[PDB]
Amino acid sequence: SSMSYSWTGALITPCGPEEEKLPINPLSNSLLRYHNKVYCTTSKSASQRAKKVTFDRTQVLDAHYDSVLKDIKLAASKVSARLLTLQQACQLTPPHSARSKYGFGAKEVRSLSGRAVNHIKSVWKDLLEDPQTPIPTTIMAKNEVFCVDPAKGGKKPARLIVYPDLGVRVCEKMALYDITQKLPQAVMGASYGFQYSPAQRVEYLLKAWAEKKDPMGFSYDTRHFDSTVTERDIRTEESIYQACSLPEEARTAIHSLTERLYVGGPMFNSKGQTCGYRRCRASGVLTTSMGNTITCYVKALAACKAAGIVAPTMLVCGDDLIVISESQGTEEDERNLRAFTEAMTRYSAPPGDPPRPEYDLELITSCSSNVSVALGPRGRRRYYLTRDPTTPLARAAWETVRHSPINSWLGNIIQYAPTIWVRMVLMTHFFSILMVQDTLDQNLGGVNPLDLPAIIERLHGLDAFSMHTYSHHELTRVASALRKLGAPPLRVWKSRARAVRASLISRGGKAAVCGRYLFNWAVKTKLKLTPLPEARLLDLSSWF
Numbered sequence: 001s002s003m004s005y006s007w008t009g010a011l012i013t014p015c016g017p018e019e020e021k022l023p024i025n026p027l028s029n030s031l032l033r034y035h036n037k038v039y040c041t042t043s044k045s046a047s048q049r050a051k052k053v054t055f056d057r058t059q060v061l062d063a064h065y066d067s068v069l070k071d072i073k074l075a076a077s078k079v080s081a082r083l084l085t086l087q088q089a090c091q092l093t094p095p096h097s098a099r100s101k102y103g104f105g106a107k108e109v110r111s112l113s114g115r116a117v118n119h120i121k122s123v124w125k126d127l128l129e130d131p132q133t134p135i136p137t138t139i140m141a142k143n144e145v146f147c148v149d150p151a152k153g154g155k156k157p158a159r160l161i162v163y164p165d166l167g168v169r170v171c172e173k174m175a176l177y178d179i180t181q182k183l184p185q186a187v188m189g190a191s192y193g194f195q196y197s198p199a200q201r202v203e204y205l206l207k208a209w210a211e212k213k214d215p216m217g218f219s220y221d222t223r224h225f226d227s228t229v230t231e232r233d234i235r236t237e238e239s240i241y242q243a244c245s246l247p248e249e250a251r252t253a254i255h256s257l258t259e260r261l262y263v264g265g266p267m268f269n270s271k272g273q274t275c276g277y278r279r280c281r282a283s284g285v286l287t288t289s290m291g292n293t294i295t296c297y298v299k300a301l302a303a304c305k306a307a308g309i310v311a312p313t314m315l316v317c318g319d320d321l322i323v324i325s326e327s328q329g330t331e332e333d334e335r336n337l338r339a340f341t342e343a344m345t346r347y348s349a350p351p352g353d354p355p356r357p358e359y360d361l362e363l364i365t366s367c368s369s370n371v372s373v374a375l376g377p378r379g380r381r382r383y384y385l386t387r388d389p390t391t392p393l394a395r396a397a398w399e400t401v402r403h404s405p406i407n408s409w410l411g412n413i414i415q416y417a418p419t420i421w422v423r424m425v426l427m428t429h430f431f432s433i434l435m436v437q438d439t440l441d442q443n444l445g446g447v448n449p450l451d452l453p454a455i456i457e458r459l460h461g462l463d464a465f466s467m468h469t470y471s472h473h474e475l476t477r478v479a480s481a482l483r484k485l486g487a488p489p490l491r492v493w494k495s496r497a498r499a500v501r502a503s504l505i506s507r508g509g510k511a512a513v514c515g516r517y518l519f520n521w522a523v524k525t526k527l528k529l530t531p532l533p534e535a536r537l538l539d540l541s542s543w544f
């Protein structure tokens with residue numbers, strides 16, 4: 001039926017110069033040695049990504065799909081969604097969102113400057129007036145960092161990002177922001193994945209697993225998911241949006257954005273040249289995450305019905321899916337998964353690695369992460385979220401004239417606090433660096449490092465400071481990632497941690513509380529860690 005993209009043959013070009021690694025990486029050359037292995041995707045590889053995501057889709061739906069979609073619209077019809085004022089939409093624009101072609105950017109939009117508001121008013125007018133003319137978009141290579149992997153072909157090519165002008169992006173929110181905030185929860189319930197913190201994600205997967213008499217689980221890796229979303233899926237999304245109770249102006253806007261932007265359009269490079277034409281999901285529109293989550297969910301739940309998955313409990317996150325169900329025995333479970341893959345493939349959601357059933361929760365990886373287990377201070381099993389530390393370590397070593405990795409370190413320390421790699425490696429390094437810089441109470445992206453113990457207790461529980469006897473998989477993977485990146489082994493981080501702990505303790509105050517709580521693992525004579533009052537008086541509902 002339809003190709004995902006066409007190409008004029010024009011280069012996908014950068015926005016200015018993309019920047020060289022340097023000969024010394026002073027913040028990270030004591031963390032790891034093999035800096036040669038750390039790389040950033042650039043436009044030089046955009047052409048190669050284009051090839052991998054340009055292909056034919058044909059889609060065949062069926063009674064199971066139709067039934068799931070019908071249930072979903074009924075669930076949607078219980079939502080009431082308001083327009084946002086132009087001004088509210090403007091205030092929701094992020095601080096460094098890409099500037100508009102019409103002589104203004106994020107700062108002007110967020111201060112409701114006159115010409116910004118004027119332009120947006122006219123953009124919105126035209127959305128109400130013209131429900132047809134395709135809206136132009138810019139195509140760019142994303143710049144992301146990874147560690148080279150010879151197993152899987154050296155260096156990944158850059159992902160492509162496709163987006164309309166800042167004015168339009170503001171309009172999208174006027175039409176759809178309230179929906180983006182209400183629909184997934186309304187349509188999917190506990191299955192909507194973005195509502196959970198790591199600890200909660202673990203709790204959900206564990207309750208799901210315990211509820212089945214003989215559980216089986218799998219993840220579904222979907223290949224270039226954005227490229228496999230069809231016009232029809234996109235129009236079916238509009239149709240789900242339109243099931244909700246909406247003002248009429250919203251409807252026209254939503255319909256018009258659907259037909260003019262979402263469904264597809266032409267793509268221009270940064271130098272202005274016509275680059276191609278798109279008939280799939282754009283990465284850089286407001287509905288991307290919501291859309292992918294909803295469509296992935298419909299397709300997947302239909303596939304479960306097609307394939308005979310019994311009593312399924314799902315967790316969905318854009319293109320990432322995990323399903324835990326009642327096993328029918330291995331021979332059948334293998335059969336049903338093959339049926340699932342066949343159904344998804346028919347629905348235009350074909351797999352990357354084909355799925356496989358598992359009967360141990362540590363062996364299921366989704367959102368690049370998995371559940372593992374360790375023991376707590378009183379001897380009890382403690383489950384937590386973890387992941388391969390390779391890419392976090394590579395990004396911990398990305399250091400240029402224009403980028404500092406310290407933030408990235410902190411993101412991982414918080415999200416993955418209970419892991420052995422965060423506790424023994426990243427935490428040891430982060431504090432060591434800040435101490436020597438004497439910047440231990442700077443403010444990183446809104447967080448004050450000396451509050452970590454509070455924050456971690458709130459997010460992960462006090463047991464995060466007292467876990468031991470990590471799993472074989474985890475010990476193996478962490479040892480192996482350190483070796484792969486030429487970082488010191490754990491043995492050495494332990495010495496470094498003893499030293500970092502001492503200096504923290506010796507400065508008293510919140511620093512010493514960090515030393516005591518965060519590095520209790522590093523000393524023979526364990527202190528008894530008690531709840532932190534500063535932690536009760538703290539609400540991080542905001543972040544998840």
Ligand SMILES: [Cl-]
Binds near residue numbers: 381
């Ligand atoms: Cl315990």
